[PDB]
Design an enzyme around this catalytic site. Structure first.
Site, PDB file in Angstrom:
ATOM      1  N   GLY A 187     -30.338   8.256  26.165  1.00  0.00           N
ATOM      2  CA  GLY A 187     -30.757   9.211  27.178  1.00  0.00           C
ATOM      3  C   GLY A 187     -31.536  10.394  26.666  1.00  0.00           C
ATOM      4  O   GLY A 187     -31.711  10.565  25.453  1.00  0.00           O
TER       5      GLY A 187
ATOM      6  N   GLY B 104     -32.340  14.797  27.862  1.00  0.00           N
ATOM      7  CA  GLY B 104     -31.892  15.935  28.652  1.00  0.00           C
ATOM      8  C   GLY B 104     -32.753  17.145  28.368  1.00  0.00           C
ATOM      9  O   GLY B 104     -33.798  17.034  27.730  1.00  0.00           O
ATOM     10  N   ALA B 105     -32.306  18.302  28.845  1.00  0.00           N
ATOM     11  CA  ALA B 105     -32.960  19.581  28.553  1.00  0.00           C
ATOM     12  C   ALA B 105     -32.860  19.888  27.058  1.00  0.00           C
ATOM     13  O   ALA B 105     -33.727  20.548  26.473  1.00  0.00           O
ATOM     14  CB  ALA B 105     -32.302  20.695  29.360  1.00  0.00           C
ATOM     15  N   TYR B 106     -31.791  19.361  26.463  1.00  0.00           N
ATOM     16  CA  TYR B 106     -31.367  19.660  25.098  1.00  0.00           C
ATOM     17  C   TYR B 106     -31.802  18.659  24.008  1.00  0.00           C
ATOM     18  O   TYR B 106     -31.515  18.895  22.837  1.00  0.00           O
ATOM     19  CB  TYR B 106     -29.836  19.789  25.062  1.00  0.00           C
ATOM     20  CG  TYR B 106     -29.079  18.833  25.983  1.00  0.00           C
ATOM     21  CD1 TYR B 106     -29.491  17.502  26.160  1.00  0.00           C
ATOM     22  CD2 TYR B 106     -27.936  19.255  26.656  1.00  0.00           C
ATOM     23  CE1 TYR B 106     -28.794  16.641  26.988  1.00  0.00           C
ATOM     24  CE2 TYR B 106     -27.236  18.397  27.487  1.00  0.00           C
ATOM     25  CZ  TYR B 106     -27.668  17.094  27.647  1.00  0.00           C
ATOM     26  OH  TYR B 106     -26.971  16.242  28.471  1.00  0.00           O
ATOM     27  N   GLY B 107     -32.466  17.561  24.371  1.00  0.00           N
ATOM     28  CA  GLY B 107     -32.967  16.585  23.383  1.00  0.00           C
ATOM     29  C   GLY B 107     -32.734  15.136  23.780  1.00  0.00           C
ATOM     30  O   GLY B 107     -32.219  14.860  24.860  1.00  0.00           O
ATOM     31  N   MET B 108     -33.098  14.217  22.890  1.00  0.00           N
ATOM     32  CA  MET B 108     -33.013  12.774  23.131  1.00  0.00           C
ATOM     33  C   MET B 108     -31.907  12.127  22.324  1.00  0.00           C
ATOM     34  O   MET B 108     -31.785  12.372  21.133  1.00  0.00           O
ATOM     35  CB  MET B 108     -34.321  12.093  22.744  1.00  0.00           C
ATOM     36  CG  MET B 108     -34.391  10.635  23.153  1.00  0.00           C
ATOM     37  SD  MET B 108     -36.076   9.994  23.157  1.00  0.00           S
ATOM     38  CE  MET B 108     -36.190   9.401  21.478  1.00  0.00           C
ATOM     39  N   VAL B 109     -31.125  11.270  22.969  1.00  0.00           N
ATOM     40  CA  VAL B 109     -30.041  10.563  22.287  1.00  0.00           C
ATOM     41  C   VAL B 109     -30.359   9.075  22.151  1.00  0.00           C
ATOM     42  O   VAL B 109     -30.765   8.416  23.117  1.00  0.00           O
ATOM     43  CB  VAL B 109     -28.680  10.739  23.006  1.00  0.00           C
ATOM     44  CG1 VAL B 109     -27.583   9.952  22.283  1.00  0.00           C
ATOM     45  CG2 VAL B 109     -28.302  12.204  23.060  1.00  0.00           C
TER      46      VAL B 109
ATOM     47  N   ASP C  31     -16.284  25.127  29.078  1.00  0.00           N
ATOM     48  CA  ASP C  31     -17.056  24.197  29.872  1.00  0.00           C
ATOM     49  C   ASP C  31     -16.410  22.816  29.932  1.00  0.00           C
ATOM     50  O   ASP C  31     -17.080  21.820  29.840  1.00  0.00           O
ATOM     51  CB  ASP C  31     -18.509  24.110  29.384  1.00  0.00           C
ATOM     52  CG  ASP C  31     -19.461  23.560  30.452  1.00  0.00           C
ATOM     53  OD1 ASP C  31     -19.181  23.660  31.668  1.00  0.00           O
ATOM     54  OD2 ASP C  31     -20.498  23.000  30.063  1.00  0.00           O
TER      55      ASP C  31
HETATM   56  N1  620 Z   1     -21.265  10.935  20.492  1.00  0.00           N
HETATM   57  C1  620 Z   1     -21.909  10.326  21.494  1.00  0.00           C
HETATM   58  N2  620 Z   1     -21.957   9.025  21.674  1.00  0.00           N
HETATM   59  N3  620 Z   1     -22.692   8.842  22.754  1.00  0.00           N
HETATM   60  N4  620 Z   1     -23.066   9.944  23.220  1.00  0.00           N
HETATM   61  N5  620 Z   1     -22.607  10.908  22.455  1.00  0.00           N
HETATM   62  N6  620 Z   1     -22.801  12.191  22.622  1.00  0.00           N
HETATM   63  C2  620 Z   1     -24.157  12.799  22.554  1.00  0.00           C
HETATM   64  C3  620 Z   1     -24.473  13.093  21.215  1.00  0.00           C
HETATM   65  C4  620 Z   1     -24.736  12.090  20.255  1.00  0.00           C
HETATM   66  C5  620 Z   1     -25.055  12.448  18.933  1.00  0.00           C
HETATM   67  C6  620 Z   1     -25.108  13.799  18.567  1.00  0.00           C
HETATM   68  C7  620 Z   1     -24.845  14.798  19.492  1.00  0.00           C
HETATM   69  O1  620 Z   1     -24.943  16.100  19.050  1.00  0.00           O
HETATM   70  C8  620 Z   1     -24.565  17.171  19.910  1.00  0.00           C
HETATM   71  C9  620 Z   1     -24.769  18.347  19.209  1.00  0.00           C
HETATM   72  C10 620 Z   1     -25.856  19.154  19.541  1.00  0.00           C
HETATM   73  C11 620 Z   1     -26.057  20.358  18.870  1.00  0.00           C
HETATM   74  C12 620 Z   1     -25.212  20.757  17.868  1.00  0.00           C
HETATM   75  C13 620 Z   1     -24.116  19.971  17.517  1.00  0.00           C
HETATM   76  C14 620 Z   1     -23.887  18.775  18.199  1.00  0.00           C
HETATM   77  C15 620 Z   1     -24.541  14.436  20.824  1.00  0.00           C
END
Ligand code: 620
Length: 346
Positions: A22, A24-29, A139
């Protein structure tokens, strides 16, 4: 570098076979194969450095996640970025791949009482650890509760988390708030900045209600809608609870409303376990000073098959930010992010 949709996803050589999950506003996964551990993982591309607010949120979340170590809190496995500050435009965060989340589960699946109990235990176990470090999540909601195919649950998204500060929690009526509307405690709209642990217990209560019914209990469309939803179920606050609200605009707004009586929980949730409803009542208390704390919740009879305080760890020390991340320029934040992520460099 490997590419996904329009965008470079430069995570080689350890991580290959990328698939879009996916945006979002915050980046691509994306998911990816970890050639070192021989498992698929999740990787998020973050590009925060032009925006001071995005830098703040990113740094805060990295610091918290690297400090915490707990089975019910998502961890950071690896962080990929360029070798120099000059070349660093993006950061890639690697986490365990979690197949689903409680939001997606609730949209599509009926939960057994056994799953509700287990899910709630895991949420509270994780929350005990977070609160023991003097941190508030702020949150909590179903989309921030990740699940794998064996129903292990991990709390995520600490971008709005703060160190508790009870002494500075007071504010005026209708003060802006950033966290997700339906899970905001009533006091946020009245007299609170959300700097005490009670605001997280409210959110857990909302999540428990949603698990019992598959729908949000307080789906307010804007502010006083969010409150008038709450009061239609809990009933009008007592004089004793209003005497807690010293600010006149908030108190007089509540006095202006028509009287509402409490709707008993067993009328809303006739299929629910009576012990679950008793615990729900204690979490969804209007007055935050009367709201149950996390340790009391874990000790409640609903959870007796799981409760084991010797296997419910606390943090070894309280958490504190070495600096105030609000007034730093984005260039300083870029440097700090560089420094915090250095431990993952070869
Ligand atoms: N862990 C996971 N498995 N599927 N979706 N999902 N969550 C989204 C996600 C995946 C990999 C890294 C992620 O980082 C979130 C993050 C963003 C900024 C700082 C620290 C952590 C988020």
């Amino acid at each position: 570098p490997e590419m996904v949709r329009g965008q470079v996803f430069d995570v080689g050589p350890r991580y290959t076979n990328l698939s879009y999950i996916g945006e979002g506003a915050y980046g691509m996964v994306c998911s990816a194969y970890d050639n070192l551990n021989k498992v698929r993982v999740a990787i998020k591309k973050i590009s925060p450095f032009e925006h001071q607010t995005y830098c703040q949120r990113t740094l805060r979340e990295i610091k918290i996640l690297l400090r915490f170590r707990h089975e019910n809190i998502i961890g950071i496995n690896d962080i990929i970025r360029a070798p120099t500050i000059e070349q660093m435009k993006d950061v890639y965060i690697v986490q365990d791949l979690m197949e689903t989340d409680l939001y997606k589960l609730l949209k599509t699946q009926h939960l057994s009482n056994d799953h509700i109990c287990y899910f709630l235990y895991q949420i509270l176990r994780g929350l005990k650890y977070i609160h023991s470090a003097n941190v508030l999540h702020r949150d909590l909601k179903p989309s921030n509760l990740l699940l794998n195919t064996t129903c292990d649950l991990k709390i995520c998204d600490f971008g709005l988390a703060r160190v508790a500060d009870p002494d500075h929690d007071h504010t005026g009526f209708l003060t802006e708030y950033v966290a997700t509307r339906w899970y905001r405690a009533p006091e946020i709209m009245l007299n609170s900045k959300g700097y005490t642990k009670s605001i997280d217990i409210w959110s857990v209560g909302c999540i428990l209600a949603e698990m019992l019914s598959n729908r949000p209990i307080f789906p307010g469309k804007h502010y006083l809608d969010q409150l008038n939803h709450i009061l239609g179920i809990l009933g009008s606050p007592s004089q004793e609870d209003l005497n807690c609200i010293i600010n006149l605009k908030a108190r007089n707004y509540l006095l202006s409303l028509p009287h509402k009586n409490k709707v008993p929980w067993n009328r809303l949730f006739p299929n629910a376990d009576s012990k679950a409803l008793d615990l729900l009542d204690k979490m969804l208390t209007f007055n935050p000073h009367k709201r149950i704390e996390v340790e009391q919740a874990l000790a409640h009879p609903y959870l007796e098959q799981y409760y084991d305080p010797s296997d419910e760890p606390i943090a070894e020390a309280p958490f504190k930010f070495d600096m105030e991340l609000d007034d730093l320029p984005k260039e300083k934040l870029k440097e700090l992010i560089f420094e915090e992520t250095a431990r993952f460099q070869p």
